[PDB]
Design an enzyme around this catalytic site. Structure first.
Site, PDB file in Angstrom:
ATOM      1  N   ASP A  34      47.954 -64.703  25.936  1.00  0.00           N
ATOM      2  CA  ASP A  34      48.583 -65.117  27.210  1.00  0.00           C
ATOM      3  C   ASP A  34      50.113 -65.194  27.121  1.00  0.00           C
ATOM      4  O   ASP A  34      50.639 -66.162  26.619  1.00  0.00           O
ATOM      5  CB  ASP A  34      48.070 -66.524  27.568  1.00  0.00           C
ATOM      6  CG  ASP A  34      48.721 -67.080  28.794  1.00  0.00           C
ATOM      7  OD1 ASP A  34      49.038 -66.292  29.715  1.00  0.00           O
ATOM      8  OD2 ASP A  34      48.948 -68.295  28.925  1.00  0.00           O
ATOM      9  N   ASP A 220      52.642 -61.499  32.633  1.00  0.00           N
ATOM     10  CA  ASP A 220      51.566 -62.470  32.325  1.00  0.00           C
ATOM     11  C   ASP A 220      50.237 -61.854  31.920  1.00  0.00           C
ATOM     12  O   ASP A 220      49.412 -61.591  32.771  1.00  0.00           O
ATOM     13  CB  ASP A 220      51.328 -63.342  33.577  1.00  0.00           C
ATOM     14  CG  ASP A 220      50.781 -64.716  33.248  1.00  0.00           C
ATOM     15  OD1 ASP A 220      50.184 -64.880  32.184  1.00  0.00           O
ATOM     16  OD2 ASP A 220      50.875 -65.705  33.993  1.00  0.00           O
TER      17      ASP A 220
HETATM   18  C1  LIG Z   1      42.912 -64.842  32.710  1.00  0.00           C
HETATM   19  C2  LIG Z   1      41.594 -64.239  33.215  1.00  0.00           C
HETATM   20  C3  LIG Z   1      41.257 -64.536  34.684  1.00  0.00           C
HETATM   21  N1  LIG Z   1      42.015 -65.660  35.265  1.00  0.00           N
HETATM   22  C4  LIG Z   1      41.661 -67.053  34.954  1.00  0.00           C
HETATM   23  C5  LIG Z   1      40.434 -67.457  35.789  1.00  0.00           C
HETATM   24  C6  LIG Z   1      40.852 -68.420  36.902  1.00  0.00           C
HETATM   25  C7  LIG Z   1      42.987 -65.341  36.121  1.00  0.00           C
HETATM   26  O1  LIG Z   1      42.965 -64.217  36.593  1.00  0.00           O
HETATM   27  C8  LIG Z   1      44.056 -66.280  36.523  1.00  0.00           C
HETATM   28  C9  LIG Z   1      44.334 -66.375  37.879  1.00  0.00           C
HETATM   29  C10 LIG Z   1      45.318 -67.223  38.336  1.00  0.00           C
HETATM   30  C11 LIG Z   1      46.057 -67.965  37.448  1.00  0.00           C
HETATM   31  C12 LIG Z   1      45.790 -67.877  36.083  1.00  0.00           C
HETATM   32  C13 LIG Z   1      46.602 -68.691  35.190  1.00  0.00           C
HETATM   33  O2  LIG Z   1      46.981 -69.788  35.571  1.00  0.00           O
HETATM   34  N2  LIG Z   1      46.926 -68.175  33.985  1.00  0.00           N
HETATM   35  C14 LIG Z   1      47.485 -68.950  32.902  1.00  0.00           C
HETATM   36  C15 LIG Z   1      46.690 -68.649  31.648  1.00  0.00           C
HETATM   37  C16 LIG Z   1      45.221 -68.991  31.787  1.00  0.00           C
HETATM   38  C17 LIG Z   1      44.810 -70.272  32.093  1.00  0.00           C
HETATM   39  C18 LIG Z   1      43.454 -70.558  32.163  1.00  0.00           C
HETATM   40  C19 LIG Z   1      42.495 -69.597  31.949  1.00  0.00           C
HETATM   41  C20 LIG Z   1      42.893 -68.323  31.649  1.00  0.00           C
HETATM   42  C21 LIG Z   1      44.252 -68.034  31.550  1.00  0.00           C
HETATM   43  C22 LIG Z   1      48.919 -68.500  32.714  1.00  0.00           C
HETATM   44  O3  LIG Z   1      49.418 -69.275  31.640  1.00  0.00           O
HETATM   45  C23 LIG Z   1      49.723 -68.704  34.015  1.00  0.00           C
HETATM   46  N3  LIG Z   1      51.175 -68.442  33.870  1.00  0.00           N
HETATM   47  C24 LIG Z   1      52.014 -69.302  34.747  1.00  0.00           C
HETATM   48  C25 LIG Z   1      52.182 -70.755  34.287  1.00  0.00           C
HETATM   49  C26 LIG Z   1      52.056 -71.799  35.203  1.00  0.00           C
HETATM   50  C27 LIG Z   1      52.190 -73.134  34.810  1.00  0.00           C
HETATM   51  C28 LIG Z   1      52.469 -73.466  33.482  1.00  0.00           C
HETATM   52  C29 LIG Z   1      52.614 -72.435  32.545  1.00  0.00           C
HETATM   53  O4  LIG Z   1      52.902 -72.608  31.218  1.00  0.00           O
HETATM   54  C30 LIG Z   1      52.936 -73.975  30.785  1.00  0.00           C
HETATM   55  C31 LIG Z   1      52.465 -71.105  32.968  1.00  0.00           C
HETATM   56  C32 LIG Z   1      44.802 -67.022  35.607  1.00  0.00           C
END
Ligand SMILES: CCCN(CCC)C(=O)c1cccc(C(=O)N[C@@H](Cc2ccccc2)[C@H](O)CNCc2cccc(OC)c2)c1
EC number: 3.4.23.46
Length: 374
Positions: A34, A220
């Site tokens: 990630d 991302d």
């Molecule tokens: C990753 C595979 C499918 N997913 C997760 C299922 C809901 C997605 O497609 C998806 C959709 C929307 C948002 C995110 C997401 O929030 N991704 C974060 C990584 C993650 C978290 C949980 C599960 C899988 C992957 C990613 O870190 C977001 N980047 C922005 C961010 C926001 C707030 C704080 C941060 O760093 C502290 C980063 C993932």
């Protein structure tokens, strides 16, 4: 680095994971890769969705740090206990480092039911590491303590299961064709970049380019879709819709909200437009573009038994996000040593007969830094 080639596994819409080991002796865990976050966090409790989890009691190398962490993503939340321990990556470089590890003790909507990963490797910069920037992201520890060069690259494929390669410390020309073009990492927090022009079917969106990056454009791997900022999205879909007037679809569909289906032999690909983002180049007034197909933004959802797909471009409010929709088109090099990200046409990107994902330059764009935001 054929050691690392093919070291990423996944299922559609559940991200990409790499095998790592944590503690002595080594506990094997599948960790999601990630570049959207900066915490290395792993399940440390028997949540029913997990195949495995970190048992800190079994490791002599564990060191509590008597601090707790909350990490909220846009989608998800976990609460954890900070420690350190020794972390190897079986099919990465042949080292072993003392990384920080958050032990996940409570989560909501974070882990995915049916998935095959138990943790998350945040590969971006301390500036967004929770609880604060003193908490040294894994990759910083990896570099600070080995001779592994300060860079990694990602080839996300996805032909059910996907695959790919995270080459740590390097680059591998077997993973791409043509040349790598590079766009500067604008600030070392997320992997932020600037998009300076947006085209659909070759046709500019005549939009102030500051919108495209409002308030962030970022790379991302921890996200599925291309996330255009609200107004650029409103306008992006407008021309996407209009170029693909040939056929009708419900307005919800474009807002995400319902599959749409076709024939198992021909879908209308040649009927949705290629999308091009021009990105800031390495030199004053030089840009380049990456071009994706709909075999990227129209991705399958596994009543159905026909070659079908979902629309993978959606709106946001914390920036543009070049999730896997983009990334699966290209071989992407996170050149941290040079504050810059390279794109090259990926060797595995899934195309068709006529079209293809491309990376092209140079182009002339004036005032690229004004596309940024403060
Ligand atoms: C990753 C595979 C499918 N997913 C997760 C299922 C809901 C997605 O497609 C998806 C959709 C929307 C948002 C995110 C997401 O929030 N991704 C974060 C990584 C993650 C978290 C949980 C599960 C899988 C992957 C990613 O870190 C977001 N980047 C922005 C961010 C926001 C707030 C704080 C941060 O760093 C502290 C980063 C993932």
């Amino acid at each position: 680095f054929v050691e690392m080639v093919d070291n990423l596994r996944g299922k559609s819409g559940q991200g990409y994971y790499v095998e790592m080991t944590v503690g002595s002796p080594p506990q094997t865990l599948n960790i999601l890769v990630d570049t959207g976050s900066s915490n290395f966090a792993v399940g440390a409790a028997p949540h029913p969705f997990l195949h495995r989890y970190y048992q800190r009691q079994l490791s002599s190398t564990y060191r509590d740090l008597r601090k707790g962490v909350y990490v909220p993503y846009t989608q998800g939340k976990w609460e954890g206990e900070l420690g350190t321990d020794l972390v190897s990556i079986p099919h990465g470089p042949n080292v072993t480092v003392r990384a920080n590890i958050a032990a996940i003790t409570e989560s909501d909507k974070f882990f995915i039911n049916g998935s095959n990963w138990e943790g998350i490797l945040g590969l971006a910069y301390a500036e967004i590491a929770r609880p604060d920037d003193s908490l040294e992201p894994f990759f910083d520890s990896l570099v600070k303590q080995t001779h592994v060069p300060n860079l990694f690259s990602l080839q996300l494929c996805g032909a059910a299961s996907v695959g790919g390669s995270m080459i740590i410390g390097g680059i591998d020309h077997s993973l791409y064709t043509g040349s790598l073009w590079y766009t500067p990492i604008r600030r070392e927090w997320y992997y932020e970049v600037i998009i300076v022009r947006v085209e659909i079917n070759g046709q500019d969106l005549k939009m102030d380019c500051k919108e495209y990056n409002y308030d962030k454009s970022i790379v991302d791997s921890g996200t599925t879709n291309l996330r255009l900022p609200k107004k650029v999205f409103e306008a992006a879909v407008k021309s996407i819709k209009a170029a693909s007037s040939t056929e009708k679809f419900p307005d919800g569909f474009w807002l995400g909200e319902q599959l749409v289906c076709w024939q198992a032999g021909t879908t209308p690909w040649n009927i949705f437009p290629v999308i091009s983002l021009y990105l800031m180049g390495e030199v004053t007034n030089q840009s380049f573009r990456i071009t994706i197909l709909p075999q990227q933004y129209l991705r399958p959802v596994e009543t159905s038994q026909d070659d079908c797909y979902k629309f993978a471009i959606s709106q946001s409010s914390t920036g543009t996000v070049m999730g896997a929709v983009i990334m699966e088109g290209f071989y992407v090099v996170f050149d941290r040593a040079r504050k810059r990200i390279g794109f090259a046409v990926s060797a595995c990107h899934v195309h068709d007969e006529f079209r293809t994902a491309a990376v092209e330059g140079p182009f002339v764009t004036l005032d690229m830094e004004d596309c940024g935001y403060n």
